[PDB]
Nucleic acid binder design. Sequence first.
DNA 1: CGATCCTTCCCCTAC
DNA 2: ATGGTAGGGGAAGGATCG
Lengths: 426, 218, 1004
Amino acid sequence: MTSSADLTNLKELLSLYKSLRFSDSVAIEKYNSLVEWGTSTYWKIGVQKVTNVETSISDYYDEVKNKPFNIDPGYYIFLPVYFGSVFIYSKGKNMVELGSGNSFQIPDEIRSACNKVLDSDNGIDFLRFVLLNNRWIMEDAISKYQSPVNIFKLASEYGLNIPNYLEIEIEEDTLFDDELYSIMERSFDDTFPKISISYIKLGELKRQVVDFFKFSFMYIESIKVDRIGDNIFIPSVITKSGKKILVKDVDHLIRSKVREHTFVKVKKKNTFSILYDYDGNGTETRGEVIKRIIDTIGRDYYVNGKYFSKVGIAGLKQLTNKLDINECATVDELVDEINKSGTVKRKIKNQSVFDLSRECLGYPEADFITLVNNMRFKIENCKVVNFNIENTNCLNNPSIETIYGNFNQFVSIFNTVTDVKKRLFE
Amino acid sequence: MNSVTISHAPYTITYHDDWEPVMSQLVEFYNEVASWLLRDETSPIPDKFFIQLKQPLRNKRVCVCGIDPYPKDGTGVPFESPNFTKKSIKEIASSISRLTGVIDYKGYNLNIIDGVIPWNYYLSCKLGETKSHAIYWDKISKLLLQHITKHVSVLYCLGKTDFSNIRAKLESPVTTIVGYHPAARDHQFEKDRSFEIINVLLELDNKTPINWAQGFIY
Amino acid sequence: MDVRCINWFESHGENRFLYLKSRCRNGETVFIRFPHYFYYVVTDEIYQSLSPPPFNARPMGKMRTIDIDETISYNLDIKDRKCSVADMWLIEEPKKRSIQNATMDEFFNISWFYISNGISPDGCYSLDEQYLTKINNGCYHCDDPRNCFAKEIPRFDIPRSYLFLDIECHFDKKFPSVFINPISHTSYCYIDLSGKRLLFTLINEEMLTEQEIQEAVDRGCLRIQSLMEMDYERELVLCSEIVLLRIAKQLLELTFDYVVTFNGHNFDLRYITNRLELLTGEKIIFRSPDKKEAVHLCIYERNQSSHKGVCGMANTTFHVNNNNGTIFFDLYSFIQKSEKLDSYKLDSISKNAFSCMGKVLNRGVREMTFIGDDTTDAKGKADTFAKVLTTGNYVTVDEDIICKVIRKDILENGFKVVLSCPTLPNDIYKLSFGKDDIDLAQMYKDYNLNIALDMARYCIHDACLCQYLWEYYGVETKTDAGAATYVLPQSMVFEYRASTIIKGPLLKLLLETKTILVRSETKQKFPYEGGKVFAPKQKMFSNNVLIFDYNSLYPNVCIFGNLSPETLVGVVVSTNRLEEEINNQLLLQKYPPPRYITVHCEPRLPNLISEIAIFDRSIEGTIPRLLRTFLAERARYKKMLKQATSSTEKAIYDSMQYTYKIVANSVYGLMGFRNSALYSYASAKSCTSIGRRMILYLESVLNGAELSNGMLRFANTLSNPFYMDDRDINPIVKTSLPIDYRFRFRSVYGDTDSVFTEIDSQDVDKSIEIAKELERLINSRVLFNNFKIEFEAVYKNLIMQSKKKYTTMKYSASSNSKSVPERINKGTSETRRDVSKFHKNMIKTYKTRLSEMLSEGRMNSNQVCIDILRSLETDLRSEFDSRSSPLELFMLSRMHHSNYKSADNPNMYLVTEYNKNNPETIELGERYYFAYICPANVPWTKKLVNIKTYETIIDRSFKLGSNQRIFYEVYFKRLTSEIVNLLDNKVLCISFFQRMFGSRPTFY
DNA sequence: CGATCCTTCCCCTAC
DNA sequence: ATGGTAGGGGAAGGATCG
């Protein structure tokens, strides 16, 4: 490290080279630039020059067990692999669902502060946060370390997950069957939906997950969504004569593109039946199912944005809810409270009016950008007075149609925020 | 080990099979040069010019390269002195002792380390003088360096000024790394490159690093 | 003490110094030695806060340290440029570094020396003999050059000395080796300060028999046995090889102003040094003027071969390490860097240089006499031909048969030469130098007196060709002009690129305007490409075409828009149309158009959809001022050139004007290069955008323009496309043209700095007059500020092949209808160096014939189309069957620059196989004459045997009675492709090619 | 009763 | 010691699907 060893001979490049399996896109472009500049250097020449943009963790896992197999003797730690949107990271970045690079930022500052920067060796190499809808739960880490230590102890230390990682010396090799599986499930003592149990013994990294198929044949009655909160609702499909039948459909409304009504195959283990998401091809029709979902709901709940359109809701109160301030009925009180607030004033001065309104109405990013980019305006006095459509192809998407329908309320809130900003600093 | 017969002095050169596809050409280049090369005394004896030709090239991954043999007491083996008195070898031993921590040095024979081949760009030099056979050994040196660099993985040349255009002399840039000479001269003064970039470059190409401890003599 | 400077050079010893070589009026050479300092620039606080005063310090004054870092903005909240004013100080340190915090560190030490000391590298001065110290005869030492060079005087002429030499060495089969092959002949063209010209050739006597040596001595030659017995006044001298090498060493060790060779750094000087070292062991030693440093010849290499992609390993240059004045110039590198339209073997260097008439006088037997004078073809060419004929042996009068000179006479501004060739009745000729068809290897095996004398004559001819090439290109005047314009030593003007040579005038401008522009953020590399290629409107032009050219468009754009890194107020980007509209509304009001200028640019990133850069036009930035200075001084030098009388002044001014043109033309490219001192991404993009906008404006106003009733009516309103102005916008103007004129106009093609307009007329005089009137009216009325156009030429029979590819005939503006036009091609295959020599002639003839027949068909489109198709098919079939009769030429060229993945690489394998065996040894970066067709490929069925596999190099040999190397009709299908750009009805085109080759020709 | 011709799809080289 | 990206034309060469 005399002359800095050229950043320890590209220590970050080596880390990304060994971390392709648990990396993110920005690191991929950074590594590409690093190899491109390193291949032509007075202190470094050509390298292996391998690139990848897909995040996969199948290398650290084994085949799934689908029958009451037999297990080798030894001490085991049982992990209740839940059913949620898996996230992998090491610090306050990444958290990518196997390819959806930085889809959104979870607003948990306490969680981010609590998580140590590269805890133990390399930050347990990933967190496996299921986040069923919005609840943070940690899971397997595969990283060796020691196991009864920080890796599994982080959940108990910071309260992220209920302590279900405690077991006893098992040994005495026996055939792992339904009875032991149910006994371990009851010993877990959890109410969250669990889909698998992964056993870890001292001295290994890759575990053989077990999952009993129990293929059942059931009919579908209707698909109905139920609201739990602001972006907390789940499209809980109900089949048979009102059965629950769990479906993945986490936050973002994909993998639920199943054919309406008809006959379906489902998987049930002890209490929570789960059907297929995208494995069984069959028909996988999307336009018909999206139109049926929209019609049943009542022309609301645009699919792409995983949210519901603010039909009828003009404004003057949704801004207060978004900014998390006291309820106000007049612009003057809004201005006074924003001035009084220590951080709301900073957050409204730093951000732009367009971004503020877009976040207030909860519109999708790409869809709204495209819809704006295919429209014409009549801006007067820094406010929107008249708008029109130029290309009608983008109207083919129902979500774009709903956003265009509520664009009037969007314009009203945009003008309100512009007036507030003008009255604050001018 | 195959053998070849040349027109001048030793009449017999023994070489390993790894040097097969260039040896003949070397002879075609050597004979003419010999007609003048024996005109003057040289620090290496002619019998030790091609001693390094017996070392196999299949199990070598690091090639350390110099510019010329020692002006006096030419043993034939590059950077070799079985008396711990030459400046370059003692400087390298001191540097490796500082970096690793091994003590009680009685020699640092580099030809016995697995995966590392000691090489000299010019196979001869005038006795008691600097490099004076550059014109004679030019094509032979280029041919031998081209042959070696196609088998080894990393090349480490000693001397910035001497190897200022080492990339131009070789058509294939096979990890050209140029380092300062142990003996500082000609507008240069540097002695500590940490001697560890080679290993990390080796596992950067899915190759086993080389331990810098097999060369110690006790 | 009046002196004129000749060279500035340094020393690479223990202590560095700067040397001046200069000449007085009488002719005495004076050397002056200056200390070599390292210059740093600091603010007042940094200078005062540094404890030990290192060597010296002088004040500068109040200066600004404006920050030129540019960042994108998503709103109109642009604060200001970070600009601070402070007192500055200049620090001199003999050692490498003493500050480590200098603001100005991108400039050279020599530029600082010159500008701070106010010294011009090629100026005439009156030295003061009070700050100089005598240390040795002819040398002085100066410690305070600031006032030692205070007085300047007008230029005065001084004598100079030159040395041109050539070598020839024995070889058996191919390239010689210094260990086994000796030297036979060495020629010298010694020119002294007194002007005496001495030609003399040294011949090796070790390769001759005793009786032949005695015969040579008896018939006029001189024999010597030592250096002291050598006399330069004798042409032919006979001696041993050791004495030859020692004489060469003695000659190269003397202080010549120039030593000019052709490929001498790589071959001649290296061979001489190696052979001298082998035979004796001594060295060729150069010593400094103060007798304190001594070095030897060691030809080193410079591998500066990267034009950011557009080069095949370009070329590696070879230089010598002399520490005296002795400018060692290599014409091989200079010509290679100058012209790229020939082959480099000293056989066709100056063929495309001269044109003169060679009227025949007699046609008897084999002793034809040719004459040449200024009254035949032109002035000057006859004089140059007579000058080069004094040593030539084989003469070319625009014939390709090669003739031997019998008798030569030099008459008053003319020559009379007697050739030896079969008689032939021609009347007019073109005069240029020739080539020698002799076999040196065959001559060396049977060596006798006549062979030695002929070889000596050839060597002296080559040595004199070196001088003739040096004089023809005006290298000395170019060097002086480069030293004057570019603030640099006279010995390094041709060895640096645009990024280095522009730091002198830029430093002068910064010092005079007190600006220290500095960058504090890392640069991001993302090219904007640029495009700007326009698709031609039509393919064939039966009517006439006029050409209008912009006078230095890009410098004028940079001046008009005030595009400098320090004038950019800010750049605004938008990811959506709502914010784009908001920003546009705020921008048209915050920055009024009369003062600020807003330029729309292509988005930097895919998410962005707009990008507007704002420039302030009231502070007179750096780049516009530099370009204005360059243009004004170029105009001044052109006026002085046209007002000068003596030939030397004409040459000097002509040399200066194009150096200023070159320095002005390189700024636009420099603004887009990351490693430049003028780097500005936004400024370069804005310059390209404004250039495109001006081109579009001119094309739109010129399109659809009529000339009815002597009135010039434009299609659209004449308005400034950037902001509103007070100029009239009426699209109808008065013309000083006859009322009877009735014509229409249309724009067909455009370029970066050019516009083509279409006129529905055939006459040339009327077209020229209307073009002049259009130029006047458009310059006075249409354009604005400093944007002027010029009428270049009239293009007839214009044929557009693709984008940036056309062929036509050109009538100059200063010409009439009776003047002869000039054939001009841009991008056509005739300008390519790797197509053919027969193909070019055939396509030229076919293009001319088709142009004539479409000019006068004349029934209609399809009838003339089918007529041309059938006629061309019949002609090409008649010229297809070669009925044996092996023709000449059929030769191609390419550069040996592969240096790529091994694999198979037939082109690399073909060359290296012949190099290792014997014939055609080509170095790296050297073009060679070969003929490639299907390199071991079988595309279809040939006619005879041994046709498709033909890949032999063949340098000068002739193919034997079984090769039959004529199958270039494969590429000749370009005519069919040409028909694509000329006519329709592909059905006839497909059938013929299918019958002959059957490879489904690609239409368009 | 049949295979061809199609365009990318690449490497090399020239403004 | 360093301007620069698109466009054009020749040709292997498996893919193409004939």
